[model samples]
Every structure is written in C-alpha cells, then in structure tokens.
Target: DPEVTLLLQCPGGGLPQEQIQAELSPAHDRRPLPGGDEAITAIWETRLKAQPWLFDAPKFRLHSATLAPIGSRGPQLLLRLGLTSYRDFLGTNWSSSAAWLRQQGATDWGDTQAYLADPLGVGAALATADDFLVFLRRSRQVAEAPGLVDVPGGHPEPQDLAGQLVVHELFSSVLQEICDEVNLPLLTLSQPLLLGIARNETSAGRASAEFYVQCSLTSEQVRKHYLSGGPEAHESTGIFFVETQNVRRLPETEMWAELCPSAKGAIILYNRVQGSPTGAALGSPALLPPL
Candidate 1:
C-alpha cells in the first residue's frame, strides 16, 4: 500500500477554555509553542482518552520485525506491531519498570550478559553491522530538543566499553548475552551499524549502557529466519520488529514495551535521522560498499 498520511485535529485538547490560555509550557524558550514541550504528550493523551480503540487491534499496523531463537524450529519471527495513536508515551519510565519486573522475577539481565560470551547462531549472523536502531528513530519528546537524551536505557558511560564497542563488534557477543540472560537473540540484524552510543550511571551506584544498531531487511525475510525457543526461551515469546511510525500514533500495541531497550534507541535514531537534515545533531555514517 502507498504511504497514507493522515493528520487529524480535534479541539486541541480543549483545556476547559480557561486553563488553555494559562497553561505555561515548562520549556517555553526551547519549544515552538508557548507550551511546546507538553504539546505532543498532551495531544497524544487527549486522543487516546477520546478513543479507547487506540489500544485495540484493527487500528494498528505492522512496523519492523525481528528474529529470535525457537526450540526445534531453530529461529522464528518477532512481530513488532504498530498503532496509529497512543495513550501514554513509553519513554524512560519503562526502565524503572524493568527493574521492578526483575524484582518480581519476570526478567533477568544476567542471561544476556552470558550470551555475550557465546552466541548460538540463533538467527541471521550479521554480515556487517549497519547502524544502531536506537539512533534510527525519534520519539515524542525528541520533537522538541533534537539532542535531548531520549534513551530510556539510560546514558552511556565510560564503563560502557566493558561490552562491544560498535555494532560491528556487537556481533555474537551481545546476542549471546541476551540469549543467556533473557533467552532472546539479537537476530535478523544483518550489517547493522552503530548510529549512537549511550552510557549512564544509575542512582544506586550502578553503571549501565546501551548501543544503537540499525539494519534494513524486508518483513518477509524476518519471518522466515526467526526462531521460537532455545535453551532458556520463553514459551509465549517470539522474535519480531514493529513499525515505529505506527507505534508513534498507537503505542499500546507494543507487546513487551517495557523490556525493549532497543525500541527506545530506535526512536532516538529515527529522530536524529529526520532532524539531521535541519542542522540537527543526528549523525550519519561514512558510506562504504556493502559488506
């Protein structure tokens, strides 16, 4: 289908009329409108409030997809569904949710760390790292400050070097890490590139980081190579990618929204890609022949 662009406007979050004029945008100096910083969030929330269908099926669309390890089948597809509207902005808040999930025994990072040591050829062996997905996409907050740290996985720090340096180095190391820890492989990322790097220190004296890698593959390619389960695989889980454009409008479709740190990186990368043309900080890679 051709790219269908639809712009809908309704009463502009009709703020009791009185509050509308007095709403002082916190980042007034930086944002375009007086309350520019809060505009996107407000608008998104208002639409979600108006229509509950935003979270339901039918309205959502297919975005990008990924591949993961599945028992017996070897590799399987991870579908990333997208929606045209959203109720809440899934940014850094999910990071905290991750910690909470871990406490509740829902997730663990140790397996990923271990997989970093050894990868099981779970999915597509990256021919050449393309770019970090984190740096490929942008998020609602980034619409205001192009350089703003939108990475919910936290900032990159010096200790970030403890892992792969760039997407090229990330290869089987990171894939193995996620597999050993969370039971998922960094699959289908062929010729991924390092679009950006983020490192940060948590308040609890913990240093954490993430890398953004970008790659291009057709939806069909992903479905074919994806694996369903492996040594520590999740029974109800699969590998896939969702379209960010669709999620931007409808975020509720995100399957494991809180667990996906790469999704956050993709948003930032997307914003940089679009904003770069306008003298923004989003950097581009030096071109080279396909690897």
Candidate 2:
C-alpha cells in the first residue's frame, strides 16, 4: 500500500513542493521465480527493483521564472541600485567604475576577496542585464539615528538559483534588511521580477553576473537608510548609500568590498537572473549544502 500525503497551496497557486522526487513502481510477485538457486536470487532481486522501497512519492510545487535579455561584454554588469546623495566615507570620496577602470588601465581584479597566498590576492564595464534597486535615504522627517553600516544585503549561497531569480535575491535581501531595520513588513514583495543577465571575461577570468536595475518608481513601503525604526542590518557601522550618478562620489572611510557594485552583490544578482523567477522567489534561500 502507498502512503498519501496532503498537499498545501496558497490562494491562486498551490504551495511549491519544497522537495520533489520521482514516483516508484509496483510489483505483483507472490512466489519466488521458477529457477535454480542463482536464478531465484536474481528473480528476488528483480522483484525488489520493481517494487523499490515500500511507497515513494515525490512532491511538486508551483514556480515562476523571470527573465531579462542582456548583452555580452567584459566584466558584465550584475546588478545596480538607486543611490542617495550622501558621499564621504570617513573623509575621502570615491570614484565610479568607468573612472576607476580608466585609472587601472581598463582592467578589474579577479577575486575581490580572494586571499589565498603568501603575497596578497585581489579583484567592469557597464553592460546591459545588470540588476537594479533603489538606495533611498530616510527623509529629514523620516527621523532616525545617524551612522555608517554595510548596505543592507543578503549573501545567501546560491543553492540551486541562477539567472533572473538570482537577481530577485539581491532585491529580496535589500527589502528583508529594510524590514529588519524598520520592524515593518512588506509582504507584497512575493518574488523578484527578472531584469537582465550578462556574461563577460576580464584578464583575470570569465565570469557571469545578473543585473536588477531599480525601476525608479517611488513607494512608501520601503525604508530609507537613515531611518531608525528598528535597527541596521549590519552591526559595526560605516554603511551608507549615494545616488547612482554619484556612486563614484562616495568617500572612502575604510576598505570596502571592491568592485563597482560590490562583488558579493553582483554575483547574487546574477544568480537570481538565471533561476526560477517566481516559484523559487519566496522562502528563505538554501545554501549549497556540504557534500
């Protein structure tokens, strides 16, 4: 006999099968096969294979996919966020990728955070398919504490995510962090809409990244960085945002995760682009489990 398990669904669509597996086969062998000892053993083995385990039923869930077409180029742009107009990290202002690249001989370092040898290891042009988001500041009336901290972002290990869905993770993490900061909820943000994805290769190595550009739409549902309803996503401080036009304008307080949009942010955004957009959007993302 097979075991029956109930299925769950949301409203319009059913709940996604968190896990899924293939179905099993049935058997109808009452007696052993009419054969010699070795033959009997083989028959029994065959029977077991037919029946497999007692009853195995895999689950299936509803999922949606988001996609955006991007061009191919070197150091493909992964994702971009709308920036506020506040510059000055510590006391030094920064520059943009285009400017920095020009300064560095049109090259980007591989492994922005790769520290692998006795010496020291290190780590983009702007192309389409980059993820986009907003980086608003809590207006003066917004009322909140003042300080620096890492931009609210999540670095979930791309479990089985790729493409557009990966870009969604970028926005999802930003929203989740804001929710944590404001102690508020914006459940409407179901899944990340696909924006774009692109692949490129610099002198260092070949790389793929997804882009999620901010829609440039305004909404009260989001919280600005300067607000203090709850708490900041990071603990230390030195986190802030600047307008997209002014990213290079940000001041250099301390060493920041290099790369135009922060390598961590870019990579994740890319993952979202290549994965299921809707069905795999919600739910906490799973990390690549250890083998």
Candidate 3:
C-alpha cells in the first residue's frame, strides 16, 4: 500500500500548531522527496531530534498559476511558504541526480559544515507596472546573499499566521516584507494577479512562492521612494526600479551578476507578461513550472 498521510488546510481561520503537527505525524515515505534516501533520512532524523522547532513552526505548501490570463480587472498573484530543515545543505548526496552531482562538482568549495536547522522559506513579491519592475537589495548585515539584488521579500516567520486563512498569512507576510524592506505601504499595492511557486530543483528542500501583481505606483515615484528615507536606507543599501528596456541589462551590471536563479526566473516571467523588449519573442516562461 502507498504511504498515507492526512493533509491539512486552513481556509477560514487560524489553525493551531498542534493540529497542524498532528496531521503530519502520520507515517509517510520521505524517500520520494529530493535528497530523501536512507542516508539523508538518517541525517534529517538526527537534526530534527537536536532541534524540534523545525517541525513546530507553521509550514505550508504551494498552489500556483503560471502565465494565467489577465482577469477583467487585472492580473492575479498568490504566495507560497515552505518549511524545512537546511541541514541537508551539509553533505553531497550520491542519490541525487547525476546531473546535479556534476553541477555541484564545479562549485565545490571547502567550507565549514555549519548547520542552520531553522524553518526557512523565501517570501517574494513580484510587481510590475507600466513597463517597470521592482526589486530589493539585501543589506550587508544579511547573512544569505548579502549585497545581492533580490525581490521584495524575506523568510516567512510564525507571525505570518496571525490570521485565520492561509492566504491571509501570505498576504500579511508579503505586505510586511515590502514595508520593512522598501518602506512601501500595503495599502499602496494592488491585488495580486499571478502567483508562481518554485523550489530548489536539485534538493527540493528549499521552496518559495512568487506573488505577481501590478503596482499602482509609477516607476519614478518608486525610485524616489527608495532614494529618499525609504526603508532601503536602513534595511538595504540600495533599491532599483528597472525599466523594461533595461531588463536585459541586469547582467551587465556587476551587482546583478550574482542574482539568484529564482529571481532571474521571476524577471523572465515579468518580461513575458508585459511583452517587454527582451521577453517579447519568448513565448512562455520555460523556467517556471505550472502548479
């Protein structure tokens, strides 16, 4: 018989952490997941035992609609949150695909095997308006990909579950991220249009949701906001309002060289949706997968 496990949903209200845990407590096969072979499972078990909070935090799955048609009003967007341990980042898994192993071999740099077994997920919001795109830069203090240009978002925390519905958490987390990082008010953002979901293709351990929307603010105004006393002054070193024509120029700038793959994919989707100069001929975004 196939391994059976109950899935939980919070459609109307906030579900307690205990209830969520109970639902996932059932036995199921982890071998199917990326890096879930017997060896990796042993590592996961030991890590989970050392730090129980990895499972205690409110985790979530994703539902995405890629390249969805624009509604009568406008485009639609959704948010996804994944909760998992980062201990898997430690060792090379022979069980992973041969291609993945080969790619890892190219960038194999010696580094201390430190573990960060926290419940972490990427919380990003993709906004476009009048041929302009918005993204955020990480502050020097940020541990991961510091000084790298990123979308407007961060790691999801338990506080995102303040509301009853799971979407409410997504909305809240997105708004909070934009405000904290860019000093943009939630009231200023338009409703989401297309929500895209993605994960670490090799490990599938780290996952993220990309929330797409058309912002009401003009590109000039957004640029000014970031230059002024916007939250980027503190949270980030800089902010950029990339024009449609400049989308392809991202790689030319050394700052854009280190962009994460997911961020690059988000930009590609934006180009396709807006029919920008670079993405006009490109049919659909081959980078993102349909939900």
Give the Cα lDDT of each candidate: 0.27, 0.26, 0.45
* 1-291: candidate 2 lDDT, tens digit per residue: 011111111111211122111121112111111222344334445556776663322211111122123332232222221111111110111112222322333223232211100010011111111222233222223111222122333222222233345434444554554445433344533333222222112211112222232322223323332244434452322223333323332333232233323332333333333322355434335622212
TM-score: model 1 vs. ground truth:
0.28
lDDT of 1: 0.27
* lDDT for each residue of candidate 1 in 1-291, tens digit (9 for 90 to 100): 111111111121111111111111122111122223354466556667876466521122222223333232322332222222222122111133323422333233322111010101111112113222221122333322232322212211111121123212223343443333233235533322223221111211111212223335454443333343342432223344444333333234333244223333334333343223432232334421121
Error of 1 at 200 (Å): 7.3
Predictions: Cα RMSD each: 21.9, 23.3, 11.7
Structural similarity to truth (TM-score) of each candidate = 0.28, 0.26, 0.52
Candidate 2 or 3, higher TM-score? Answer: 3
Quick one: best lDDT, which candidate? 3
lDDT per residue (tens digit) for residues 4-56 in model 3: 11111121121212222111111211112333445556766776788667643
Clashing pairs for predicted structure model 3, backbone only? 13-164, 14-164, 75-193, 76-192, 76-193, 76-194, 77-192, 77-193, 77-194, 78-195
2 against 3, candidate with superior lDDT:
3
